[PDB]
Scaffold this active site. Structure first.
Site, PDB file in Angstrom:
ATOM      1  N   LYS A   1       0.694  -1.231  -0.080  1.00  0.00           N
ATOM      2  CA  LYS A   1       0.013   0.062  -0.089  1.00  0.00           C
ATOM      3  C   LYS A   1       0.886   1.371   0.062  1.00  0.00           C
ATOM      4  O   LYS A   1       0.618   2.315  -0.733  1.00  0.00           O
ATOM      5  CB  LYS A   1      -0.909   0.037   1.277  1.00  0.00           C
ATOM      6  CG  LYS A   1      -1.850  -1.146   1.243  1.00  0.00           C
ATOM      7  CD  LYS A   1      -2.788  -1.048   2.571  1.00  0.00           C
ATOM      8  CE  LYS A   1      -2.046  -1.141   3.823  1.00  0.00           C
ATOM      9  NZ  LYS A   1      -1.275  -2.523   3.952  1.00  0.00           N
TER      10      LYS A   1
ATOM     11  N   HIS B   1      -3.363  -9.891   9.808  1.00  0.00           N
ATOM     12  CA  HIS B   1      -4.268  -9.518  10.552  1.00  0.00           C
ATOM     13  C   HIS B   1      -5.233 -10.725  11.165  1.00  0.00           C
ATOM     14  O   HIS B   1      -6.368 -10.471  11.565  1.00  0.00           O
ATOM     15  CB  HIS B   1      -5.235  -8.201  10.148  1.00  0.00           C
TER      16      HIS B   1
ATOM     17  N   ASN C   1      -1.359   6.736   6.358  1.00  0.00           N
ATOM     18  CA  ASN C   1      -0.535   5.900   7.027  1.00  0.00           C
ATOM     19  C   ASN C   1      -0.578   6.445   8.619  1.00  0.00           C
ATOM     20  O   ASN C   1      -1.183   7.538   8.768  1.00  0.00           O
ATOM     21  CB  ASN C   1       0.949   5.960   6.538  1.00  0.00           C
ATOM     22  CG  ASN C   1       1.466   7.207   6.057  1.00  0.00           C
ATOM     23  OD1 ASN C   1       1.001   8.300   5.385  1.00  0.00           O
ATOM     24  ND2 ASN C   1       2.663   7.706   7.187  1.00  0.00           N
TER      25      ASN C   1
HETATM   26  N1  LIG Z   1       2.014  -6.006  -4.519  1.00  0.00           N
HETATM   27  C1  LIG Z   1       2.832  -6.737  -3.399  1.00  0.00           C
HETATM   28  N2  LIG Z   1       2.574  -7.830  -2.807  1.00  0.00           N
HETATM   29  C2  LIG Z   1       3.338  -8.331  -1.785  1.00  0.00           C
HETATM   30  N3  LIG Z   1       4.190  -7.856  -1.109  1.00  0.00           N
HETATM   31  C3  LIG Z   1       4.323  -6.652  -1.613  1.00  0.00           C
HETATM   32  C4  LIG Z   1       4.252  -6.011  -2.546  1.00  0.00           C
HETATM   33  N4  LIG Z   1       4.721  -4.642  -2.871  1.00  0.00           N
HETATM   34  C5  LIG Z   1       5.414  -4.564  -1.926  1.00  0.00           C
HETATM   35  N5  LIG Z   1       5.457  -5.547  -1.199  1.00  0.00           N
HETATM   36  C6  LIG Z   1       6.326  -5.954   0.038  1.00  0.00           C
HETATM   37  O1  LIG Z   1       5.658  -5.817   1.112  1.00  0.00           O
HETATM   38  C7  LIG Z   1       6.373  -5.219   2.275  1.00  0.00           C
HETATM   39  C8  LIG Z   1       5.509  -4.008   2.816  1.00  0.00           C
HETATM   40  O2  LIG Z   1       5.622  -3.051   1.819  1.00  0.00           O
HETATM   41  P1  LIG Z   1       4.756  -1.705   2.084  1.00  0.00           P
HETATM   42  O3  LIG Z   1       5.286  -0.877   3.209  1.00  0.00           O
HETATM   43  O4  LIG Z   1       4.621  -0.815   0.821  1.00  0.00           O
HETATM   44  O5  LIG Z   1       3.307  -2.296   2.435  1.00  0.00           O
HETATM   45  P2  LIG Z   1       1.977  -1.670   3.459  1.00  0.00           P
HETATM   46  O6  LIG Z   1       0.840  -2.398   2.626  1.00  0.00           O
HETATM   47  O7  LIG Z   1       2.084  -0.194   3.157  1.00  0.00           O
HETATM   48  O8  LIG Z   1       2.176  -2.305   4.481  1.00  0.00           O
HETATM   49  P3  LIG Z   1       1.530  -1.884   6.180  1.00  0.00           P
HETATM   50  O9  LIG Z   1       0.381  -2.794   6.249  1.00  0.00           O
HETATM   51  O10 LIG Z   1       2.540  -2.173   7.161  1.00  0.00           O
HETATM   52  O11 LIG Z   1       1.092  -0.453   5.984  1.00  0.00           O
HETATM   53  C9  LIG Z   1       7.676  -4.980   1.564  1.00  0.00           C
HETATM   54  O12 LIG Z   1       8.465  -5.954   1.812  1.00  0.00           O
HETATM   55  C10 LIG Z   1       7.288  -4.978   0.215  1.00  0.00           C
HETATM   56  O13 LIG Z   1       8.480  -5.301  -0.461  1.00  0.00           O
HETATM   57 MG   LIG Z   2       1.926   0.971   4.961  1.00  0.00          MG
HETATM   58 MG   LIG Z   3      -0.954  -3.949   7.613  1.00  0.00          MG
END
Ligand SMILES: Nc1ncnc2c1ncn2[C@@H]1O[C@H](COP(=O)(O)OP(=O)(O)OP(=O)(O)O)[C@@H](O)[C@H]1O
Ligand SMILES: [Mg+2]
Ligand SMILES: [Mg+2]
Ligand SMILES: [Ca+2]
Ligand SMILES: [Ca+2]
Ligand SMILES: [Ca+2]
Ligand SMILES: [Mg+2]
Ligand SMILES: [Mg+2]
Length: 439
Positions: free
Chosen positions: A115, A183, A138
């Site tokens: 995300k 989660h 965030n």
């Molecule tokens: N499309 C994707 N599918 C799966 N994993 C991904 C994808 N894009 C990034 N990641 C990996 O997921 C991890 C989290 O990345 P990121 O911080 O962008 O996620 P997030 O959804 O914002 O997380 P959070 O739930 O902590 O806010 C990193 O290891 C990133 O490389």
């Molecule tokens: Mg995030």
């Molecule tokens: Mg999360």
């Protein structure tokens, strides 16, 4: 909306709850705040006039409220909140308050992983267009802090938890990037319940950007005329490989060679696609959005190349704190020599089985550490070594690397058994990569 004269109670004194306090104070309403922590961090930012209750919830404050504003960190299922809802007391979260006041289009992004990368990337596309874009949602920049009549576009990262308390979102474009087992604590009825929370993001969305490779990202009633898809092998937006090159492809047309981008990894290429589909749907010019793909540096600790020297790429994926993140890193992973894979930490009782199907092959070595190192080495004992710490594992592999190799820190575990947080873990990996691989 108009909150004059209401008894408003806020649950949570983190940055999100503080942003709610500011929101009501700016509108002449003095809310009450509570937090189950005895000394939450935000306590000493509160004004004198705000009544506060810490160390637990205050049930009579809740039961007397006209409006309860719940942090995403407490469940609608918590007994006090169930009791308030049973009484007919309205419960919302900060995103609901934001949606009622936002006067510019909203791009809304959820998903188990990726995300923050897609949210920031869409923001860069808007900035490349000269748009005064507000990017947030965030924990570090809560959406209410973005509200401003000069804002031309909002780009929000939304968790499943925030979506549960939101009913007024009308996104110009929305996506669920992916859905994987995470989660689990908050979703006692399993993956379809966790999914139903994320599916709320498509309610009243004008365009739904869906993952062609993850059917759980499809709207609840199925694909419809609103849906645009991104994927690896096919979809409206997808990836094209040939002659050793890769292109982003949109509706049958290559639009960019990925060698112009600065991100690495197939999953970041699909993140680029999702971002471009959202930007297109929001009406951002294609030319500036492609330009953003060529300048976007990526975020620290997200499949981040921190060192490329002597033909060895050192990749800090410390933010891969769960199995789905690491699985995505290993899927379609391009390595010419050997992958030296660093796994370990506190795995939080996760099932690591999914990682096995990627760890066969003559060109894989495992280096497993931290609390759960032994579990991780068990994935394939023949090519695995186990140490206490990341640094010990890195010293083990550093003399073995050769041109063509990749050293990947994709731990699939939390860091708190040995580090203050995942950022310290990533920063340590980068320090040691340069010490051991830079000269
Ligand atoms: N499309 C994707 N599918 C799966 N994993 C991904 C994808 N894009 C990034 N990641 C990996 O997921 C991890 C989290 O990345 P990121 O911080 O962008 O996620 P997030 O959804 O914002 O997380 P959070 O739930 O902590 O806010 C990193 O290891 C990133 O490389
Ligand atoms: Mg995030
Ligand atoms: Mg999360
Ligand atoms: Ca709390
Ligand atoms: Ca050991
Ligand atoms: Ca962590
Ligand atoms: Mg009292
Ligand atoms: Mg598939």
């Amino acid at each position: 909306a108009d909150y004059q004269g209401k008894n408003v109670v806020i649950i949570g004194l983190g940055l999100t709850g503080l942003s709610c306090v500011d929101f009501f104070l700016a509108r002449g309403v003095t809310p009450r705040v509570m937090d189950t922590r005895m000394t939450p961090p935000g306590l000493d930012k509160l004004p004198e006039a705000v009544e506060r209750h810490t160390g637990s919830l205050n049930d009579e404050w809740l039961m007397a409220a006209d409006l309860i504003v719940a942090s995403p960190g407490i469940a609608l299922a918590h007994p006090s909140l169930s009791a308030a809802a049973d009484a007919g007391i309205e419960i919302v979260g900060d995103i609901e308050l934001f949606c009622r006041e936002a006067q510019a289009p909203i791009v809304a992004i959820t998903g188990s992983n990726g995300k923050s990368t897609v949210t920031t990337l869409v923001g860069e596309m808007a900035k490349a267009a000269g748009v005064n874009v507000g990017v947030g949602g965030n924990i570090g920049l809560p959406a209410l802090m973005l509200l401003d009549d000069e804002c031309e576009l909002y780009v929000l990262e939304l968790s499943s938890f925030q979506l549960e308390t939101t009913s007024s979102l009308q996104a110009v474009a929305a996506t669920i990037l992916n859905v994987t087992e995470d989660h689990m604590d908050r979703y006692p009825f399993g993956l379809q319940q966790y999914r139903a929370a994320k599916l709320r993001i498509y309610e009243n969305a004008k365009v739904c950007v869906v993952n062609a490779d993850d059917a759980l990202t499809m709207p609840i009633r199925g694909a419809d005329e609103r849906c645009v898809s991104f994927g690896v092998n096919m979809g409206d937006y997808h990836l094209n490989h040939q002659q050793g090159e890769t292109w982003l492809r949109v509706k049958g047309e290559k639009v960019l060679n990925v060698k112009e981008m600065k991100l690495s990894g197939q999953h970041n290429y699909t993140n680029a696609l999702a971002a471009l589909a959202l930007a297109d749907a929001a009406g951002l010019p294609r030319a500036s959005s492609l330009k953003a793909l060529t300048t976007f540096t990526g975020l620290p600790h997200r499949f981040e190349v921190v060192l490329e020297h002597n033909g060895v790429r050192w990749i800090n994926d410390s933010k891969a704190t769960n199995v789905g993140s690491t699985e995505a890193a290993l899927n379609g992973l391009h390595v010419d020599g050997t992958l030296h894979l660093l796994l370990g930490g506190d795995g939080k009782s996760a099932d690591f089985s999914p990682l096995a199907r990627y760890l066969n092959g003559d060109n894989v070595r495992l280096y497993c550490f931290g609390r759960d190192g032994a579990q991780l080495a068990a994935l394939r004992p023949e090519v695995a070594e186990q140490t206490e710490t990341m640094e010990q594992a890195m010293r083990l592999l550093a003399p073995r690397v050769q041109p063509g190799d990749m050293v990947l820190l994709s731990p699939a575990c939390a860091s708190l058994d040995q580090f203050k947080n995942f950022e310290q873990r990533g920063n340590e990996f980068a320090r040691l990569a340069k010490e051991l691989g830079g000269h």
